Design an enzyme around this catalytic site. Structure first.
Site, PDB file in Angstrom:
ATOM      1  N   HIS B 116      -9.923   0.017   2.561  1.00 27.42           N
ATOM      2  CA  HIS B 116      -9.584   1.394   3.016  1.00 27.42           C
ATOM      3  C   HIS B 116     -10.244   2.413   2.080  1.00 27.42           C
ATOM      4  CE1 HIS B 116      -5.657  -0.358   4.923  1.00 27.42           C
ATOM      5  NE2 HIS B 116      -6.770  -0.862   5.453  1.00 27.42           N
ATOM      6  N   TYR B 120     -13.996   5.297   2.794  1.00 26.73           N
ATOM      7  CA  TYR B 120     -14.238   6.743   2.538  1.00 26.73           C
ATOM      8  C   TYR B 120     -15.595   6.912   1.849  1.00 26.73           C
ATOM      9  CZ  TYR B 120      -9.323   7.136   3.779  1.00 26.73           C
ATOM     10  OH  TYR B 120      -8.129   7.070   4.432  1.00 26.73           O
ATOM     11  N   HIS B 210       1.658  -3.081   6.841  1.00 31.36           N
ATOM     12  CA  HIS B 210       2.028  -3.011   5.400  1.00 31.36           C
ATOM     13  C   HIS B 210       3.418  -2.382   5.261  1.00 31.36           C
ATOM     14  CE1 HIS B 210      -2.506  -3.109   4.095  1.00 31.36           C
ATOM     15  NE2 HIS B 210      -2.149  -4.143   4.859  1.00 31.36           N
TER      16      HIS B 210
HETATM   17 CU   LIG Z   1      -1.085  -0.542   2.632  1.00 34.27          CU
END
Ligand SMILES: [Cu+]
Ligand SMILES: Cc1cc2c(cc1C)N(C[C@H](O)[C@H](O)[C@H](O)COP(=O)(O)O)c1[nH]c(=O)[nH]c(=O)c1N2
Ligand SMILES: [Ca+2]
Lengths: 133, 313
Positions: B116, B120, B210
């Site tokens: 993640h 970016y 998550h």
């Molecule tokens: Cu997470």
């Protein structure tokens, strides 16, 4: 004769929502060796488990398929309410549309997780009107 | 039974050297929910190179220096929170696991939150100048309102209360980034940076699981505590969420200053605060009005908001 048939995994999110509703409820067993027979009209309430893959496979829990596969159970479904999480995007609550298509029954409502006050008030009202009309 | 007279290596390492170690058993599984989650997160593996972000260049170049700066700052801020969760938060959960499979799932979480943060970087490589990238990093380091948020959670990860650590681990994917995630959906609702929005949707497909998983494991532990201690933990959750909502609002009013997005971004934040509470088994106290965002922006999150051969008919 207001009745709910519902499925909930070990996380029991759908279980907790359904127990906040006025109508009597029957749980489809988690154990794939076990089945139930329902001979009264019911609104079906199920979560979605496709997992946002790009694909409606596994959208409807296998236990819900096993339940609906019995034509005696299938014929008593007035409509389907589905749950999930909007973070799954295009796959949000898609168990409902899948069941709605397969059974030719209305998709009555969609909600998230254990539901809010508003979801409880709305689903109570929708279940009432479903058994009248 | 070998299992009842042995410990997992991570239990041995940190908590109990008085017993011999057992290898993970994927053949006899304590909690089927663990297999459910493992199969989905591993099957949902992705890398930001999979997405052609170069196709965003046209819509990106139509944005002025202020909007380009806002995006770079917002995403560098989210990069920080993912760096916190990858390097500290998710790995801290491994030793506090109820099951063997949970240990491996949190290793996957730490890796994928790393992906993640990296995603970016992939966007910045395609769209941003070296000056825009460096400026955003300077801004993140020097923004005290931004820094306050991770500074509030990290102590729970490094402290010895596993339930508070678990709540923090749930709050990060459940709440803290959604104020920032508002921006890409706002833009893609106007046909701007559509490919960037595909990366955000892949990120959310992970973060939703998550938050669910951390909240599921939280509930299993607190269920074993006395009614008094359960009320104590509920009190702590609302007290911490109150603090974090306060820090997030302060930050978002600074981030979106002069753009007029703070109000909608905060409502999207509170919508997700409501879902965080539900994932911990607590009712959301937030009004559908308090959490409402524009339908065109919500449609970018989910258009649905508006097969297996076992089928016998
Ligand atoms: Cu997470
Ligand atoms: C592995 C996995 C996969 C999915 C989900 C979750 C998990 C853990 N959930 C969300 C899920 O339906 C939601 O949390 C329900 O509230 C769970 O209901 P039960 O706790 O099983 O009754 C989900 N939601 C959705 O809208 N679309 C989906 O494709 C999925 N898939
Ligand atoms: Ca990569």
């Amino acid at each position: 004769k207001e009745l709910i048939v519902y499925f909930s995994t070990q996380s029991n999110n759908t279980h907790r929502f359904v127990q906040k509703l006025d109508a009597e409820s029957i749980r489809i067993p988690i154990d794939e060796e076990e089945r139930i027979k329902v001979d009264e009209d019911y609104v079906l309430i199920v979560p979605t488990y496709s997992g946002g893959k790009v694909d409606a496979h596994g959208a409807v829990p296998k236990q819900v398929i096993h339940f609906l596969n019995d034509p005696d159970n299938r014929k008593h479904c007035l409509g389907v309410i589905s749950s999930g999480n909007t973070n799954f995007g295009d796959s949000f609550a898609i168990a409902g549309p899948v069941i709605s298509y397969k059974l030719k029954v209305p998709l009555l409502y969609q909600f998230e997780l254990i539901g809010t006050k508003e979801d409880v008030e709305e689903v109570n009202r929708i279940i009432s009107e479903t058994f009248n009309a | 039974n070998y299992y009842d007279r042995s410990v997992s290596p991570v239990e041995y390492a940190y908590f109990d050297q008085s017993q011999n170690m057992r290898a993970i058993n994927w053949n006899k599984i304590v909690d089927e929910k663990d297999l459910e989650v493992w199969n989905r997160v591993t099957q949902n593996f992705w890398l930001p190179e999979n997405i052609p972000v170069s196709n965003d260049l046209p819509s990106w170049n139509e944005l002025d220096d202020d909007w380009q700066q806002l995006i770079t700052r917002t995403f560098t801020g989210l990069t920080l929170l993912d760096t916190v969760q990858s390097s500290i938060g998710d790995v801290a959960q491994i030793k506090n696991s109820l099951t063997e499979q949970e240990q491996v799932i949190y290793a996957n979480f730490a890796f994928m939150v790393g992906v993640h943060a990296r995603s970016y970087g992939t966007i910045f490589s395609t769209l941003c100048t070296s000056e825009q990238i460096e400026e955003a990093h300077e801004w993140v380091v020097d923004n005290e309102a931004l820094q306050a948020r991770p500074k509030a959670l990290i102590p729970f990860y490094t402290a010895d209360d596993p339930l508070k650590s678990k709540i923090a681990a749930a709050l990060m994917p459940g709440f803290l980034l959604y104020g920032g995630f508002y921006l890409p959906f706002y833009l893609s609702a106007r046909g701007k940076l559509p490919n960037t929005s595909d990366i955000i949707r892949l990120i959310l497909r992970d973060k939703v699981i998550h938050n669910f998983y951390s909240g599921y494991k939280y509930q299993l532990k607190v269920a074993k505590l006395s009614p008094e201690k359960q009320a104590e933990m509920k009190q702590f959750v609302f007290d911490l969420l109150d603090k974090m909502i306060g820090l997030e609002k302060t930050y978002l009013h600074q981030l979106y200053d002069g753009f007029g997005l703070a109000d909608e971004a905060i409502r999207f934040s509170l919508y997700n605060a409501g879902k965080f509470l539900q994932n911990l088994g607590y009712e959301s106290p937030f009004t559908k009005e308090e959490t409402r965002i524009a339908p065109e922006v919500f449609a970018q999150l989910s258009a649905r908001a508006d097969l297996d051969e076992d089928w016998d008919f």
